[PDB]
Amino acid sequence: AVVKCKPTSPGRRHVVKVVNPELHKGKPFAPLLEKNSKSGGRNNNGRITTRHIGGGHKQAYRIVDFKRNKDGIPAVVERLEYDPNRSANIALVLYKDGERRYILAPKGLKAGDQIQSGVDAAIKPGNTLPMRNIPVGSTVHNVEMKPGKGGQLARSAGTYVQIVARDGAYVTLRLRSGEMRKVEADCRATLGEVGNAEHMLRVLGKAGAARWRGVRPTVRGTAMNVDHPHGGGEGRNFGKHPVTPWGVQTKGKKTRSNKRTDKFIVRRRS
RNA sequence: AGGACCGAACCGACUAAUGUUGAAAAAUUAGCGGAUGACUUGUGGCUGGGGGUGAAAGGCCAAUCAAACCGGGAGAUAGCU
RNA sequence: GCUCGCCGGAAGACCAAGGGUUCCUGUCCAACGUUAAUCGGGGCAGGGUGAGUCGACCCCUAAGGCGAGGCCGAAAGGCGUAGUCGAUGGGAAACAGGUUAAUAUUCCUGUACUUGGUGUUACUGCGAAGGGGGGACGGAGAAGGCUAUGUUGGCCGGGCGACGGUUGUCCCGGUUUAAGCGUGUAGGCUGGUUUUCCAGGCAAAUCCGGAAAAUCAAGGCUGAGGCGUGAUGACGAGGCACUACGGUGCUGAAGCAACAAAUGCCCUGCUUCCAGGAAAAGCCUCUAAGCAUCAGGUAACAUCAAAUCGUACCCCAAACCGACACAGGUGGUCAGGUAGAGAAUACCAAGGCGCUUGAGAGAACUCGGGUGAAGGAACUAGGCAAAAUGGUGCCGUAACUUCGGGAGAAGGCACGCUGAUAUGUAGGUGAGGUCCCUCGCGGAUGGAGCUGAAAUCAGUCGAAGAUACCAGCUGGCUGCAACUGUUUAUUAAAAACACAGCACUGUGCAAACACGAAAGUGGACGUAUACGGUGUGACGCCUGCCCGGUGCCGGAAGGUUAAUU
RNA sequence: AAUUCCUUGUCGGGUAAGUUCCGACCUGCACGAAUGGCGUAAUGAUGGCCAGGCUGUCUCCACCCGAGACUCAGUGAAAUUGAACUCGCUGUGAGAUGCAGUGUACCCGCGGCAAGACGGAAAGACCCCGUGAACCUUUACUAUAGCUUGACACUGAACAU
RNA sequence: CUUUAAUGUUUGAUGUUCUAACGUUGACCCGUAAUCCGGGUUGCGGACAGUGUCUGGUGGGUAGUUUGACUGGGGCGGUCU
């Protein structure tokens, strides 16, 4: 639930938490865990490729199954769990054969609900079927863009895409960004929405709350000397067009220079 | 419960005096700040010079930084001493 | 040798790193020592470092490094797979006492433990470069139960006091003892046992997981400490023979109990929280191909082996880093006594020091401090500095406010000692004894003994009772920034930088973007409630007019227009 | 006003006396609404200001305890230094120990002050010069990485218009 | 030779389709106890994309440079035959 803390101290006035008693108050399933060494925004060369990244709280990787290729075997939800590697919560399921796996937790899922993957599955949240069998005008998540590789769209907290049409071997979708894309009509998609919608109402309330996530502080550039176009000056001058480091606009300039697909795009956005 | 309160260690370094061929190539003395945290610290590792890193001061990169050090071009050039 | 003074959560003791003989002894004093020097971390010579259990090596791996092939790249070379290296982490075993001028858990004494090899005997399904389990893990907080250790008492030994008193409720000292083995408690976790069955764990599996039944509820795992054993021993204040008064043999009393009590152990526990908490091996199991009167496996007994290197000395320092025997810097461990909340502070113990120039004098002036008539900031750029405040308990406490604060607001009263209440109370601990029993490290009852505040009344001393050290000045108006934080190592700690929060914008995943000639990596094992960039900078009321100019995003009728032809 | 030149703006508060400070007026030289505007409890080794207490901050210094300074013994530096038999005054040459004139002055030390020796220290950082630099900015010049446009090549087959 | 249409060859423009180059940081098999790489099957894209050469535009993102003299100091102004 979305709860507002009390201002007993500076650092708790504007903080807002998202707690859920339905989550597992213990350790997760170990066989589905693996190391996750932090990077710091650096690469194999040791250079900072992405800034504002470093430190934070340790994490272990929850092996998630975005493919959902176990068809013809129902599984029931054992327990919900909190995943640090992502914003949404996951769910530990148990397959009749004794196989346990993690999946994204949809909107209205609990511990004990049944779900199944495949073309012969039922139309209920949590089930995975190819969009060829999914009706038109529905709401799905963890959508696949190529059959066999795994869901890649609508994997976030409260994200969901809506199927808009299906002409042939392709189906048109309106992604959460407002984009109207079309993918093959054989890509597996999951029914329902990822349930953490209140995740966006969360509020850090203090700086250190961001440093736990691994986010390092951000320095603007206006008072930045040889180091950034904006640079400096006696006072707050900034008498030039807003520009990135390395010299690009950042306030309207489109940088889509792929031009490979150019087919699935219909209503890019806005 | 807490980037909460007082306050040692620990980490810092606001004021004054001394010292200024000093005890010390930035410290001492008396006070001062934080002190469960964006904390602190050991060991090892990565980032290499028009580059790195930088909660950004043109700050730090071995007492050296508006472009490190060493060697080489090199007996640079100097209408100036 | 006798006094004095200093440190004593260190200026004591044990180590790592580092240094590398500075360690012990003898001998020497030119230079080195900021003086002298018979002395020395000096010079010369000699001596000294003993390990199956400590550590390294070794097995395992993190970050990350190298990297067969391979991909990429003018050459150089770069990235990287399989693999192989790499601790600051995981992994088998030793304690006490004694001993040397210098070493010892390494030697001696006594008592133990661990992993292996081999052999004998008996019983036998053994088997991996695979599977599974386990190893294996956060922060804060709450207590409870123990010990280290300490205090008092008792006991044993000695003592009867340089000056009044001291055979007594007196004084001093001692009152220690391990690993391991046996017991398995406080307490923590878990529901167990048997059988059948299955799309799972690459294949297999009796193992793990899962499913459906029967059958019982006590079963097991973990576990500080305690007791006993170890120990008729060792140690032991002191003696007795020697005693070059350096010390060597022998002998050697008591060696208990209560109370208090940790920041350590139970505890990798319990509870709770969001920021959601390493890996791999050893170890326990499972089977595969294969081997079965074999080989291997299990238990006992015997025997053998456990190599190699380090081990001296310093280690908050005169031995390391600072050119110095330099007020500096340097990580971890042990953590006594009185008062105290306390690792502050004051005084002491253990133990270690008095800091490698002294003597005398008692002018100016300087440094560091103390006191001060009357006045009390009139000083000064400025209350710089100094002075002052300073504690616990109770009462009391404004505007303003985001209702949390402000706040320790301000302010005011009381604090010692003795006695009684109560020969030491409430409370805490808990004996013998008694009763029960699943008869045990059990439960109940029992309250001796020990320990022990706080308060009231009364009385009493002093100028002064929070008497030392220690230990907030307070209040008001107001600018800036929300706040905690960060920064110009070495003249600037701020109104600057961050900041949570807001907005614009880009980004549909082989994402944008970035480092890279490229491969590729990061972004991210993330997917628009995400990521990047820019500006603003909590919260609250708000954020107005202008697209002519530049830029950005779009569009077309035409014109202009590159290579090319 | 962290912004106001005129300027110590005018009035008022507070002080015996207030260029600062506080509160209003607006005549905003030259505030202004996310390079944000106006407020804001709390916080701050933050800036400014007013009181109480407090005191040697001062009026106005005085004494005292210690460490140096002073003397003795021992060891034993340094910056600086053209050479010195190294006075004042006035004038002169452009601020005289050294010239002129004149005055004064026995020789040599110790302890103190710091006016001068344009004292020591650092080939002035300010100013200017140089057809010296180095960094930084931009609608300065010329190039360039990158991004982007198209032609040709890697690159072919049909069909229809 | 002045002339004009269905055809034939001829080449060019636009559009649709296809697959065989090429791409695949999709799936599966092997090398192979290997998320590298390659090969193989197959699917999706598909002569687009991407790369090489040429070329226009943009290009302080980055380099190499310029930015006068006289002057009652220099600058501003003025001046330069």
Swiss-Prot record:
Positions where N6-acetyllysine occurs in the chain: 240
Organism of provenance: Escherichia coli (strain K12)
Compositionally biased spans, kind Low complexity: 38-47
Subunit structure: Part of the 50S ribosomal subunit. Forms a bridge to the 30S subunit in the 70S ribosome, contacting the 16S rRNA. Interacts weakly with S6 in one of the 3.5 A resolved structures. In pull-down experiments interacts with CedA.
NCBIfam families on file: rplB_bact
Family: Belongs to the universal ribosomal protein uL2 family.
Record-linked InterPro entries: NA-bd_OB-fold, Rib_uL2_dom2, Ribosomal_uL2, Ribosomal_uL2_bac/org-type, Ribosomal_uL2_C, Ribosomal_uL2_CS, Ribosomal_uL2_dom3, Ribosomal_uL2_RNA-bd_dom
HAMAP family xref list: Ribosomal_uL2_B (MF_01320_B)
Region (Disordered): 27-52, 220-270
Further comment: This protein can be partially replaced in vivo by its H.marismortui (HmaL2) or human (L8, from the 60S cytoplasmic ribosome) homolog.
Keywords: Acetylation, Ribonucleoprotein, Ribosomal protein, RNA-binding, rRNA-binding
Name of the featured protein: Large ribosomal subunit protein uL2
Function: One of the primary rRNA binding proteins. Located near the base of the L1 stalk, it is probably also mobile. Required for association of the 30S and 50S subunits to form the 70S ribosome, for tRNA binding and peptide bond formation. It has been suggested to have peptidyltransferase activity; this is highly controversial. In the E.coli 70S ribosome in the initiation state it has been modeled to make several contacts with the 16S rRNA (forming bridge B7b, PubMed:12809609); these contacts are broken in the model with bound EF-G.
UniProt KW Lipid biosynthesis keyword: no
Entry GO CC: cytoplasm; cytosol; cytosolic large ribosomal subunit; DnaA-L2 complex
GO term, biological process aspect, one: negative regulation of DNA-templated DNA replication initiation
One Pfam family in the UniProt entry: Ribosomal_L2
Disulfide bonds: none
GO molecular function: RNA binding; rRNA binding; structural constituent of ribosome; transferase activity; zinc ion binding
PROSITE patterns membership: RIBOSOMAL_L2
